[PDB]
Structure formats: C-alpha cells, structure tokens
Write an enzyme that holds these catalytic residues in place. Structure first.
Site, mmCIF file in Angstrom:
data_model
loop_
_atom_site.group_PDB
_atom_site.id
_atom_site.type_symbol
_atom_site.label_atom_id
_atom_site.label_comp_id
_atom_site.label_asym_id
_atom_site.label_seq_id
_atom_site.Cartn_x
_atom_site.Cartn_y
_atom_site.Cartn_z
ATOM 1 N N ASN A 1 0.822 -1.203 0.000
ATOM 2 C CA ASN A 1 0.000 0.000 0.000
ATOM 3 C C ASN A 1 0.858 1.256 0.000
ATOM 4 O O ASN A 1 0.468 2.268 -0.556
ATOM 5 C CB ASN A 1 -0.940 0.019 1.215
ATOM 6 C CG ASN A 1 -1.878 -1.181 1.256
ATOM 7 O OD1 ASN A 1 -2.287 -1.618 2.332
ATOM 8 N ND2 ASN A 1 -2.218 -1.721 0.084
ATOM 9 N N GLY B 1 4.418 1.107 -0.692
ATOM 10 C CA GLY B 1 5.667 0.912 -1.389
ATOM 11 C C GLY B 1 5.750 -0.480 -1.976
ATOM 12 O O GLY B 1 4.741 -1.053 -2.371
ATOM 13 N N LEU C 1 8.115 -4.425 -2.248
ATOM 14 C CA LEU C 1 8.956 -5.412 -1.580
ATOM 15 C C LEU C 1 9.860 -5.984 -2.645
ATOM 16 O O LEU C 1 9.404 -6.371 -3.730
ATOM 17 C CB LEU C 1 8.081 -6.516 -0.943
ATOM 18 C CG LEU C 1 8.781 -7.445 0.045
ATOM 19 C CD1 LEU C 1 9.231 -6.693 1.318
ATOM 20 C CD2 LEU C 1 7.843 -8.594 0.428
ATOM 21 N N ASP D 1 -3.751 -3.859 13.786
ATOM 22 C CA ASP D 1 -3.945 -4.166 12.368
ATOM 23 C C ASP D 1 -4.125 -5.662 12.141
ATOM 24 O O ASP D 1 -3.560 -6.225 11.208
ATOM 25 C CB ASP D 1 -2.798 -3.614 11.502
ATOM 26 C CG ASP D 1 -3.188 -3.453 10.021
ATOM 27 O OD1 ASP D 1 -4.401 -3.274 9.719
ATOM 28 O OD2 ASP D 1 -2.279 -3.500 9.169
HETATM 29 C C1 LIG Z 1 8.379 -9.159 7.185
HETATM 30 C C2 LIG Z 1 7.853 -8.866 5.747
HETATM 31 C C3 LIG Z 1 8.518 -7.626 5.120
HETATM 32 N N1 LIG Z 1 7.989 -10.029 4.834
HETATM 33 C C4 LIG Z 1 8.981 -10.958 4.823
HETATM 34 N N2 LIG Z 1 8.750 -11.818 3.812
HETATM 35 C C5 LIG Z 1 7.635 -11.381 3.152
HETATM 36 C C6 LIG Z 1 6.912 -11.868 2.034
HETATM 37 N N3 LIG Z 1 7.313 -12.967 1.385
HETATM 38 C C7 LIG Z 1 6.694 -13.480 0.240
HETATM 39 C C8 LIG Z 1 6.520 -12.653 -0.860
HETATM 40 C C9 LIG Z 1 5.944 -13.137 -2.038
HETATM 41 C C10 LIG Z 1 5.563 -14.462 -2.085
HETATM 42 C C11 LIG Z 1 5.729 -15.321 -1.008
HETATM 43 CL CL1 LIG Z 1 5.267 -16.963 -1.083
HETATM 44 C C12 LIG Z 1 6.314 -14.831 0.166
HETATM 45 N N4 LIG Z 1 5.810 -11.175 1.674
HETATM 46 C C13 LIG Z 1 5.380 -10.077 2.325
HETATM 47 N N5 LIG Z 1 4.265 -9.433 1.913
HETATM 48 C C14 LIG Z 1 3.555 -9.911 0.713
HETATM 49 C C15 LIG Z 1 4.180 -9.297 -0.529
HETATM 50 O O1 LIG Z 1 4.292 -10.247 -1.557
HETATM 51 N N6 LIG Z 1 6.046 -9.587 3.411
HETATM 52 C C16 LIG Z 1 7.167 -10.246 3.813
#
Ligand SMILES: CC(C)n1cnc2/c(=N/c3cccc(Cl)c3)nc(NCCO)[nH]c21
Ligand SMILES: CC(C)n1cnc2/c(=N/c3cccc(Cl)c3)nc(NCCO)[nH]c21
Ligand SMILES: CC(C)n1cnc2/c(=N/c3cccc(Cl)c3)nc(NCCO)[nH]c21
Length: 295
Positions: free
Chosen positions: A11, A13, A15, A121
């Site tokens: 929302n 930015g 990843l 949240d």
């Molecule tokens: C602690 C936060 C920053 N974090 C750590 N790993 C992730 C994350 N991992 C993913 C992303 C894309 C696909 C899958 Cl299966 C896992 N996804 C997300 N959010 C969904 C974005 O695809 N957040 C994650």
C-alpha cells in the site's frame, strides 16, 4: 530469482528480493518512497526493534536506511500469508487448523503486549508462515507494525488514557469499540483475532459485502451489523468455545490485562476433546505452497 526482483506490491511501497552478504541468504527489502507524505516505514522499524527477534514468530530485522529514491528496511524473508493459504484451501479452514492458528497467535499477541505495544492491524494478510526450506514453516509470524502504538508510557510506566472520537485498521476484523471511535487497547487486538477465527471457520463474516454511500457509511454499516449480529448467531454450529472467547474479549475493560492463558486453555481443551494432535498438519500441508524464491 535474482536479487532486485519485485516480490510484493504494498500500500505504501514495494517489496524486493535482497541478499545478506554475510550468509548468502535471501532477505526481504521493504521500500517506501522518500517522497512519501505519510511515512510509516521508520516507525515500523522502531517498533520491530522494541520487540526484538528473540520471541518466536517475529521476523529478524537487519537494516534501515536510504536507498536511492526509497527508504529501505531489510528483514527476514518469510512465506505466504494466512489469507493466501486461506485462498489455497478454497476459503475455509478446519477446526483443527483454526485452533492451531489461534493458540499460536494468542501467544504472539501476548508477546507483543508484553513489549508494551498494541498492534491494531489484525488481519489474515499480516500473519505469514516461515519459508518451506527454513524449517520454520510451522511458525506463524506477525508482520506490519505500521499501525502499532505504545500503550504503556515509557516515562510514567502508566497505561495510555482512555479517549474517544478516534480515526478508524481494517474494517472487517476490527472490534466493536474501534467502530465507535474509542482508543484501542489490548482487548481490541484479541477481539479482532476472534473475528478472524470466525472468518476462517465460517468462510466469511455476515458484515462482508455491504453496500454504502461512502467509506464513512460502509464502516458505519459494518459496525452496526457487528453489533446486531449476536455471538450465538455468529458462532452457530461451531464449538461453544468460540462464543466463549468472543464474549470474554468483548467484555474486557479498557485498562484490563487479558487472561491470555485462559483463552489458550479454552482452545487447547477443545483441541484435546476433539482428539486432535498438535502436529502442525495445517490444511495447507500437502498442497503446493507458494515460495518467494528457490535457491
Ligand atoms: C516481514 C515482511 C517484510 N515479509 C517478509 N517476507 C515477506 C513476504 N514474502 C513473500 C513474498 C511473495 C511471495 C511469497 Cl510466497 C512470500 N511477503 C510479504 N508481503 C507480501 C508481498 O508479496 N512480506 C514479507
Ligand atoms: C541489489 C539490491 C536489490 N540488493 C540486494 N541485496 C540488498 C540488500 N541487502 C541487505 C541490506 C542490509 C542488510 C542485509 Cl542482511 C541485506 N539491501 C539493499 N538495500 C538496502 C541497503 O542499502 N539492496 C540490496
Ligand atoms: C549486514 C550488512 C553489512 N549487509 C549484509 N548484506 C548487505 C547488503 N547486500 C547487498 C547489497 C547490494 C548488492 C548485493 Cl548482491 C547485496 N547491502 C548492505 N548495504 C548497506 C550497507 O551495509 N548491507 C548488507
């Protein structure tokens, strides 16, 4: 695949895939434009640091700093969310899965509260399993501390005061008192969890899909419908313990320390009564789990 790949569209930015040069492990790089007129990422970093990476089910956090046109927060790469897994399982979970989730998330939320934070949240998108290879696939992690708040004042060590006429987290799961504009406290995190548990068991909540004049009116219709839906109706044909949970958390007072152990024992006793084994065989185990990266 290669580092720099976009692996999420958020929302505020995006990843991206990174590497930790110390270990060769992949990491997650959460990005927020430096031009943001509502910056949240540094707040989140500060909260993650207050929590620490000691307690289980919190992502490790490695770095915060400016990176081109973004601010970057770098942290442990995790698996899919409970909402993604819910979709994978055709949008219902078994009682066994929901109880395993609930028991764990009650410990997770207790831990967050023990660090003087309220979360604010609660939603399935914010609970992620560990990655498959990384032996923590059974662990449900809490992420996204952007809306969190310190509920004990660091200076006075006193609980934040009661207040009304507040903003308005996510409407589908938020507590009734949140809908009424009351300052959120520990009880409201636990009520949102209860709404989420019932979402998983039922497949939906009866305040989903309501039509409105504006955002304001939808929040209003959702809040009205929550109040007008008795717990008995909401939990019909599910174990009485779900209704017991909701009643308890709905009846907590603003300053009150929840009895987290009472709530976990409610679910553990049901779990044993049903003859289930806590083997982490969630409904999604045996199905093709989305993975952010291979190597
Ligand atoms: C602690 C936060 C920053 N974090 C750590 N790993 C992730 C994350 N991992 C993913 C992303 C894309 C696909 C899958 Cl299966 C896992 N996804 C997300 N959010 C969904 C974005 O695809 N957040 C994650
Ligand atoms: C080639 C680009 C997409 N890339 C690849 N890996 C990284 C990256 N990895 C980090 C940064 C800080 C700590 C850790 Cl453990 C990994 N950080 C960043 N940016 C944040 C630090 O400047 N970019 C990275
Ligand atoms: C724990 C710290 C020393 N650490 C570990 N890995 C990284 C890091 N990873 C990168 C950055 C650019 C390209 C690549 Cl392939 C990895 N970047 C950075 N950049 C920020 C300055 O250290 N830090 C990293």
């Amino acid at each position: 695949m290669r580092v720099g790949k976009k692996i999420g569209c958020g929302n505020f930015g995006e990843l991206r895939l990174g590497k930790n040069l110390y270990t060769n492990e992949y990491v997650a790089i959460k990005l927020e434009p430096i031009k943001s007129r509502a910056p949240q990422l540094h707040l989140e970093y500060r909260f993650y640091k207050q929590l620490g990476s000691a307690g289980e089910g919190l992502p490790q956090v490695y770095y915060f700093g400016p990176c081109g046109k973004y601010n970057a927060m770098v942290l442990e790469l995790l698996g899919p969310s409970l909402e993604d897994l819910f979709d994978l399982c055709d949008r219902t979970f078994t009682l066994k899965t929901v109880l395993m989730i609930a028991i764990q998330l009650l410990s997770r939320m207790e831990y967050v509260h023990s660090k003087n934070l309220i979360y604010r949240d609660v939603k399935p998108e914010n609970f992620l399993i560990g990655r498959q290879g990384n032996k923590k696939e059974h662990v449900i992690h809490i992420i996204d501390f952007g809306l969190a708040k310190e509920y004990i004042d660091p200076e006075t060590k006193k609980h934040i005061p009661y207040r009304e006429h507040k903003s308005l987290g996510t409407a589908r799961y938020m507590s009734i008192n949140t809908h009424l504009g009351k300052e959120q406290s520990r009880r409201d995190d636990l009520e949102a969890l209860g709404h989420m548990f019932m979402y998983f068991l039922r497949g939906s909540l009866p305040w989903q899909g309501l039509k409105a004049d504006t955002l304001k009116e939808r929040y209003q219709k959702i809040g009205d419908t929550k109040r007008n839906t008795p717990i008995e109706a909401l939990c019909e044909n599910f174990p009485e313990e779900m209704a017991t949970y909701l009643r308890y958390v709905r009846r907590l007072d603003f300053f009150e320390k929840p009895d987290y152990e009472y709530l976990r024992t409610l679910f553990t006793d049901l779990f044993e009564k049903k003859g289930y084994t806590f083997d982490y065989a969630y409904d999604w185990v045996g199905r093709p789990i989305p993975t952010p990266v291979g190597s």
